[PDB]
C-alpha cells in the first residue's frame, strides 16, 4: 500500500500501545503485530496491525534490529510522527 505519515500523541505515563515483531536480524521490517485497545496507537487512529514502521520522528527504522527499534521507539515522547506502510 501507500507510504503514510501518521501522528501519535501520548502522555509520559503511557507506552505507545503497540506490539512489534520482526527486525533486520530476521530479514523483515519492524512490524506492528498488535494495537492495544484504548492506548495511544489505537487512539491516534492511523496505525494498524500489519503496518511496517519505516521511521519514527525522522529516524529510519528500515534496517534496524529488533532491540535497536525498541530503544528508539520507546525514547520518543509527546507528539510522535510515524512513517508506515501496509503490505
Amino acid at each position: 500500500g501507500p507510504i503514510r505519515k501518521v501522528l501519535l500523541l501520548k502522555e509520559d505515563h503511557e507506552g505507545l500501545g503497540i506490539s512489534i515483531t520482526g527486525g533486520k536480524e530476521h530479514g523483515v521490517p519492524i512490524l506492528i503485530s498488535e494495537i492495544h485497545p484504548g492506548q495511544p496507537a489505537d487512539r491516534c487512529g492511523g496505525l494498524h496491525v500489519g503496518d511496517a514502521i519505516l521511521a519514527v520522528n525522522g529516524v529510519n527504522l528500515r534496517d534496524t534490529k529488533h532491540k535497536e527499534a525498541v530503544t528508539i521507539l520507546s525514547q520518543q515522547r509527546g507528539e510522535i510522527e510515524f512513517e508506515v506502510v501496509y503490505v
Binding site: 503497540i18 515483531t21 530476521h26 498488535e34 529488533h66 525498541v70
Partner: peptide
C-alpha cells in the same frame, strides 16, 4: 521472531 510490547 521476537515480539515486544512498547
Amino acid at each position: 521472531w521476537p515480539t515486544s510490547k512498547i
